[PDB]
């Protein structure tokens, strides 16, 4: 069980850790989050009470270092940092555990939600999408644009998701135009899976990361990426059975977790109706179809 200590909380803020959140008042004696499950990536995120513009946060894995949050009054945000002095960090984390100035990661024992949303998400792949190699953790916010969005502006602050474009030479073999456009299996299996991602685990990891950035930060380019990766699978007539079954589980837990009130803006009507009712895989996503129809029958 790992800990992220906080030097203070000088401004009122809603703090998120994974799917949990809590309000901290200005100058409230808050000194961090304990009992964080080892074995998963995690995301600690922020929304200031006085400007809900810019949700921002940090993806991290406590196995890779000792991390803390400190407010920067010049840049005006809570920053993640890495403490290299292990003794000092353990000493500080103990003092606070003793003074009970930390909230506890509130994981119910039955509850596999976070695992189910991050099953294929690996910190090493996050760090290739979010490029800042001097840190072991990765900053994301509401406003960051994707490489594909930049093509259609600061590259250092971009989300380097894998570019998917259904009307591109990469997606369409010369001489197989109609075939490849109407059945995207060659783009999915040869170009993307064998060529770029190497395996379906890496593909799902990027899909899951894109959803979580869409949900936690309202990051629009991330939402576009999540839907494109869904649509590429659903628009392929030949998909391994284990991938379809896993995709159904992945999407089920995503739809389950999505705030009911944010469905209007985070769910693309065209993609979902196509995927569930028109696509090659329209009968292969039973769990997802059932939860969608019972939770969001309007969208459909």
């Amino acid at each position: 069980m790992n800990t992220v200590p906080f030097t203070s909380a000088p401004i009122e803020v809603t703090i998120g850790i994974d799917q949990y959140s809590f309000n901290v008042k200005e100058n409230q004696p808050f000194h961090g989050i304990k009992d964080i499950p080892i074995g998963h990536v995690h995301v600690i995120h922020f929304q200031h009470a006085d400007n809900s513009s810019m949700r921002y946060g940090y993806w991290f894995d406590c196995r890779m270092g000792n991390f803390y949050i400190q407010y920067d009054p010049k840049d005006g945000l809570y920053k993640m940092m890495e403490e290299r002095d292990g003794a000092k960090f353990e000493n500080i984390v103990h003092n606070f555990k003793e003074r009970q100035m930390m909230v506890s990661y509130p994981k119910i024992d039955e509850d596999d939600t976070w695992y189910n949303l991050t099953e294929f998400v690996q910190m090493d792949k996050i760090r290739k999408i979010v490029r800042k190699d001097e840190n072991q953790f990765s900053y994301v916010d509401s406003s960051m644009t994707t490489v594909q969005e930049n093509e259609l502006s600061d590259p250092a602050h971009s989300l380097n998701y894998t570019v998917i474009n259904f009307k591109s030479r990469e997606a369409i073999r010369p001489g197989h135009e109609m075939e490849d456009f109407l059945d995207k299996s060659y783009y999915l299996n040869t170009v993307m899976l064998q060529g770029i991602f190497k395996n379906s685990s890496n593909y799902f990891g990027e899909l899951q990361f894109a959803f979580l950035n869409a949900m936690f930060f309202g990051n629009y380019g991330s939402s576009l990426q999540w839907h494109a990766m869904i649509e590429l699978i659903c628009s392929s007539a030949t998909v391994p059975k284990h991938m379809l079954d896993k995709l159904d589980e992945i999407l089920y837990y995503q739809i389950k977790t999505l705030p009911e009130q944010y469905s209007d803006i985070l769910l693309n009507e065209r993609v979902w109706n196509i995927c569930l009712y028109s696509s090659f895989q329209k009968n292969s996503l039973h769990n997802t179809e059932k939860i969608m129809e019972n939770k969001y029958p309007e969208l459909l």
Binding site: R169, I172, E177, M178
Partner: protein
């Protein structure tokens, strides 16, 4: 974006462009079988690819053999159209290739865009104009070459004959669309108007009769009367 009445003179500027109409690519006759079911029999079709500035018509004849053993022919026909337009463009010298292709039916956009990925600078556009190019098969010489084809074939025509020696492209296109609209609304009457006077003939190298400027004005009036007549017959007005 889309082509409409606001940007109509764009058709006659000096940027090479082509209209593509796919409405006569996949043509069938529907008939009863011996068992009393219904079946279709394909007949030869054509892509109508037209430069509205010069009158040059690239008529790609679609022979029924291209459908043999294929499924979902109405979908395939849009992709076959796109394949043939892409091949046409690739066959042209660079300075003759179009800068824009305007499709008359929006279902052609994705097929054509996908076939033209090698040409990122050629704009593929829809139009809000309702153009009567489906009536091209009412032009006798075009219908004849299509129905007589025994294999795929490309035939080149100038659909304006020699009109551009006397009138502008804008006026030539307006005459062409008036004639085709009339032929689409009442083909028998339209063809009667065009041929009722045997002293005016169609040159061997032409599609339409050799009307004088004054005769064209009369013909054009009779075509507007025909279109208004049919509009009244139709809607009871």
């Amino acid at each position: 974006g889309a082509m409409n009445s606001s940007n109509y003179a764009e058709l006659f500027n000096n940027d090479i462009k082509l209209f593509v109409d796919d409405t006569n690519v996949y043509r069938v006759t529907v008939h009863k079988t011996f068992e009393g079911n219904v079946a279709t029999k394909a007949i030869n079709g054509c892509i109508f690819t037209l430069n509205p500035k010069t009158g040059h018509l690239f008529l790609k004849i679609i022979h029924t053999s291209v459908w043999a053993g294929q499924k979902r022919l109405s979908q395939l026909a849009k992709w076959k159209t796109a394949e043939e337009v892409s091949a046409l463009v690739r066959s042209l010298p660079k300075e003759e290739q179009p800068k824009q292709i305007i499709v008359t039916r929006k279902a052609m956009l994705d097929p054509l865009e996908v076939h033209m990925l090698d040409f990122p600078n050629i704009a593929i556009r829809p139009t809000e104009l309702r153009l009567p190019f489906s009536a091209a098969m009412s032009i006798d010489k075009l219908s004849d070459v299509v129905m007589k084809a025994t294999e795929p074939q490309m035939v080149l025509f100038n659909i304006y004959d020699d009109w551009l020696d006397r009138i502008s492209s804008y006026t030539a296109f307006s005459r062409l669309t008036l004639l085709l609209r009339a032929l689409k609304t009442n083909e028998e009457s339209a063809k009667m108007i065009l041929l009722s006077d045997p002293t005016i003939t169609i040159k061997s190298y032409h599609l339409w009769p050799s009307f004088t400027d004054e005769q064209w004005i009369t013909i054009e009036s009779q075509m507007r009367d025909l279109i208004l007549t049919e509009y009244g017959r139709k809607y009871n007005v």
